[PDB]
Amino acid sequence: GNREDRKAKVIEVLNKARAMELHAIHQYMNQHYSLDDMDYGELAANMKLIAIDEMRHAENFAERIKELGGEPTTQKEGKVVTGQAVPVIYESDADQEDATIEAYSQFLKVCKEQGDIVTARLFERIIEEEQAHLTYYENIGSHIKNLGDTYLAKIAGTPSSTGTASKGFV
């Protein structure tokens, strides 16, 4: 289609992806608070670090949406599942990252269809980061499945720090 139409179709998949990120941020941070509460430090820490990757994805999608003339969404897609036990956390996050990669690859095809190279490349890079998340989650899930409590005993009491504090305003 025309210039405006081309931007609009891409703005639409960008807002769908971004809404998926917003969901991931809250879901992963929800699991983070639980892991932290259970005092599984290394697990709690990497979960937050992955939530921060999703915050960056959300921001990148937003910045591209503005560059195309659109308005970045503020609504998350789907609802957050709370109270998941450890094995459910890792099995569900693996499923969610898989679904994400599936959807983002369809979104990339749309960008290519609309002749938007820059946005297509954005999705490409982010899909590669989602793959890292998927592999991480699959591996934790696999050890939980195969090694049970004996694997968890080693994470118990480990540091949970994600580094120096959030460069903020105050």
Q: Which of residues 30-59 bind ligand FEC (CB under 6 A)?
A: 52, 55-56, 58-59
Q: Cα–Cα distance between 156 and 58 in angstroms, integer?
A: 32
Query: Which two three-digit tokens encode residue 142?
Result: 């696999």
- The DSSP output letter for 83 is S
CB of 128 to a second copy, least distance (A): 6
Of 66 and 112, the one with the shorter C-beta distance to ligand FEC is 66
Query: Which two three-digit tokens encode residue 87?
Result: 């094995």
CB of 145 to a second copy, least distance (A): 6
Segment contacting Fe ion by CB under 5 A, of 4-12, 16-24, 82-90, 150-158: 16-24
Q: Cα–Cα distance between 99 and 103 in angstroms, integer?
A: 6
**In the Cβ-directed half-sphere of 147, how many Cα atoms lie within 13 Å?**
12
What sign does the dihedral 93-97-155-51 (CA atoms) show? negative
Which residue of the chain is nearest ligand FEC when measured via CB?
166
Does 166 interact with ligand FEC (rule: CB under 6 A)?
yes
Does 117 interact with ligand FEC (rule: CB under 6 A)?
no
CB of 1 to a second copy, least distance (A): 24
- The DSSP output letter for 103 is H
Does 57 interact with Fe ion (rule: CB under 5 A)?
yes
CB of 112 to a second copy, least distance (A): 9
Does 62 interact with ligand FEC (rule: CB under 6 A)?
yes
Query: Which two three-digit tokens encode residue 54?
Result: 């999703």
Q: Cα–Cα distance between 7 and 4 in angstroms, integer?
A: 5
Of 94 and 150, the one with the shorter C-beta distance to Fe ion is 94
Does 25 interact with ligand FEC (rule: CB under 6 A)?
yes
Query: Which two three-digit tokens encode residue 57?
Result: 């994805």
Of 39 and 113, the one with the shorter C-beta distance to ligand FEC is 39
